[PDB]
């Protein structure tokens, strides 16, 4: 149907760490991580993961920083293998990574990169990703040549082009890894509404996020901590079965407009108090 994981565990295997680094602050937290040692010692990166996501549902994945969110995505992509447990999903998947990549060419060439052009499809993706506001600032609009790896664009601009590229792909499952992590916080709110909630309402999709509105709108929710499932279920269930986490995070007035670093800090801290 959509995607199922039953009691899945995945161990550190050689090369997986380098892959994670190739995508591309608590980097000071990571400074005696040795990917070799994790492989020697036999260590789960993800442990006892369960989820059942139906066709057209949206799973929101959140958690503490370094909890295995991207790794779970990689597991779906087949870059990590389940050592225990069952994973079912079929069909093409489309992946939007944390690192926004940009190829030599026009904005438009970037969004349809490697895929056939369809005008209604294109115009539709451009609009829902809120790119119309960006391209209208340029003399050649979406025919603007990105005369770098889009280096002179904003981080949000690069993230929107990269989102639009993944959303434009025709696929059965969309993996969206933290597109909404930048300062232009009102644009991100329109994008989430227009792209992820409306245009994609019937696409099975997984959104890694650190905003509570995304948990609120989600069909299902996975919270990760230290490579384990801190919680899995609906937003209603989260308020009942994790009441301490919930009231803390809904306690804020405008949590979703804090920086990405601050939201991830509060999430991480909250997950530790309440074990």
Ligand X SMILES: Nc1ncnc2c1ncn2[C@@H]1O[C@H](COP(=O)(O)OP(=O)(O)OP(=O)(O)O)[C@@H](O)[C@H]1O
- Is 30 near ligand X (CB under 6 A)? yes
Question: Which member of 2, 49, 70, 215 binds ligand X (CB under 6 A)?
Answer: 70
Q: Which does 30 bind (CB under 5 to 8 A by kind): Mg ion, ligand X, none?
A: ligand X
What's the CA gap between 109 and 145, in Å, rounded? 9
What's the CA gap between 161 and 126, in Å, rounded? 8
What beta strand segments (E) does 23-119 contain?
A: 44-53, 58-63, 84-88, 93-96
At closest approach, how far in Å is the CB of 50 from Mg ion? Answer: 20
What's the CA gap between 128 and 38, in Å, rounded? 42
Instruction: Name the one range near ligand X by CB under 6 A: 64-72, 82-90, 187-195, 234-242.
Output: 64-72
Instruction: Name the one range near ligand X by CB under 6 A: 63-71, 124-132, 138-146, 149-157.
Output: 63-71
Helix/strand/coil for 154: coil
At closest approach, how far in Å is the CB of 45 from ligand X? Answer: 6
What's the CA gap between 74 and 81, in Å, rounded? 9
What's the CA gap between 144 and 201, in Å, rounded? 30
- The residue among 49 and 128 lying less far from Mg ion, judged by its C-beta, is 49
At closest approach, how far in Å is the CB of 165 from ligand X? Answer: 20
Instruction: Name the one range near Mg ion by CB under 5 A: 68-76, 147-155, 252-260, 267-275.
Output: 68-76
At closest approach, how far in Å is the CB of 212 from Mg ion? Answer: 18
- Is 265 near ligand X (CB under 6 A)? no
- Alpha helices (H) in the chain, listed in sequence order: 16-22, 35-40, 69-77, 107-111, 119-128, 132-135, 155-168, 185-191, 212-217, 235-241, 243-249, 260-273
At closest approach, how far in Å is the CB of 71 from Mg ion? Answer: 8
Touching ligand X, residues 160-179 (CB under 6 A): none
Question: Which member of 2, 68, 150, 181 binds ligand X (CB under 6 A)?
Answer: 68
Helix/strand/coil for 17: helix
- Is 263 near Mg ion (CB under 5 A)? no
Question: Which member of 20, 76, 82, 197 binds ligand X (CB under 6 A)?
Answer: 20
At closest approach, how far in Å is the CB of 168 from ligand X? Answer: 24
Interface characters, 40-59, with ligand X (x: CB under 6 A)? -----x--------------
Q: How far is CA 253 from CA 187, 212, 239, 256, in A?
A: 19, 11, 17, 9
Helix/strand/coil for 186: helix
Q: What is the largest CA-CA distance in the chain?
A: 56
- Is 69 near Mg ion (CB under 5 A)? yes
Beta bridge partners of 225: 228
The residues that touch Mg ion, with contacts defined as CB under 5 A, are 69-70
The residues that touch ligand X, with contacts defined as CB under 6 A, are 20-21, 30, 33, 45, 65-71, 264
């Amino acid at each position: 149907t959509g995607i199922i994981m039953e009691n899945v565990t995945a161990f550190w295997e050689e090369g997986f760490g380098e892959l994670l680094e190739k995508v591309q602050k608590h980097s000071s937290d990571e400074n005696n991580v040795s990917f070799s040692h994790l492989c020697l010692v036999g260590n789960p990166v993800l442990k006892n993961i369960n989820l059942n996501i139906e066709k057209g549902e949206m799973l929101a994945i959140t958690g503490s920083t370094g909890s295995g969110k991207t790794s779970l995505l990689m597991l779906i992509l087949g870059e990590l293998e389940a050592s225990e447990g069952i994973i079912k999903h079929s069909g093409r998947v489309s992946f939007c990574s944390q690192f926004s990549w940009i190829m030599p060419g026009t904005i438009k060439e970037n969004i349809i990169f490697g895929v056939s052009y369809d005008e209604y499809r294109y115009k539709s993706v451009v609009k829902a990703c809120q790119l119309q506001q960006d391209i209208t600032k340029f003399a050649e609009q979406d025919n603007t040549v990105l005369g770098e790896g889009g280096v002179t664009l904003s981080g949000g601009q690069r993230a929107r082009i990269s989102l639009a590229r993944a959303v434009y792909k025709d696929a059965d499952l969309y993996l969206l890894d933290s597109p909404f992590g930048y300062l232009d916080v009102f644009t991100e709110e329109q994008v989430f509404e227009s792209c992820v909630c409306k245009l994609m309402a019937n696409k099975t999709r997984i959104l890694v996020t650190s905003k509570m509105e995304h948990l609120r709108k989600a069909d299902k929710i996975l919270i990760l901590h230290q490579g384990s499932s801190y919680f899995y279920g609906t937003f209603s269930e989260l308020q009942s079965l994790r009441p301490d986490f919930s009231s803390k995070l809904m306690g804020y007035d405008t949590f979703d407009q804090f920086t990405e670093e601050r939201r991830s800090s509060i999430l991480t801290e909250t997950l530790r108090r309440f074990s």
